[PDB]
Amino acid sequence: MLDAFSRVVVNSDSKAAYVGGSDLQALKTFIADGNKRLDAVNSIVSNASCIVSDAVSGMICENPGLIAPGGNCYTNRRMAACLRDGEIILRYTSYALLAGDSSVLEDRCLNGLKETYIALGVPTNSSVRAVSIMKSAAVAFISNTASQRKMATTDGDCSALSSEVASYCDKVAAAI
């Protein structure tokens, strides 16, 4: 996996070039927003259980056929499977967010996921309803606009970070 700096270095390398001055100033911007980024990550991981059962309960909320016989959240074993998968995806997008790169999300989690699901019978339109709910639960927590819980941070615009985390959730909703 790569992070923000390794990603700049891989791109510089494809041209056999030392790191541009433009790229250095981008990276020092990355560094300037270091602490906002850490607060972003902290606001997701401190609420991970909330985010994952919100999203799965919601998925089932909008389509109760999932928990009728033959649906993929039917037994306790499949419900627990789905909760684990929600948790796993959220973990790899919190890696992405802390990394500044989607490298690890794509490499260690999304690669072959679409196939695995096709094989198992896991409804993909539903996985992405869950992931899209997690997207909003998460950008709420980042932006500190979640209804039932706040997290004291200093006053600033965290919108670039929220958009980042939403772009990683969309990478997931697209891998399948």
Partner: peptide, 30 residues
């Protein structure tokens, strides 16, 4: 690409863990 961020993330990935304080302190050092 070995680095503070990558070393920490992949220690946590090996363990099934979300990032925690050790991880955030490590980036702070970066």
């Amino acid at each position: 690409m070995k680095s503070v961020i990558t070393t920490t993330i992949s220690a946590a990935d090996a363990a099934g863990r979300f990032p925690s304080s050790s991880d955030l302190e490590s980036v702070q050092g970066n």
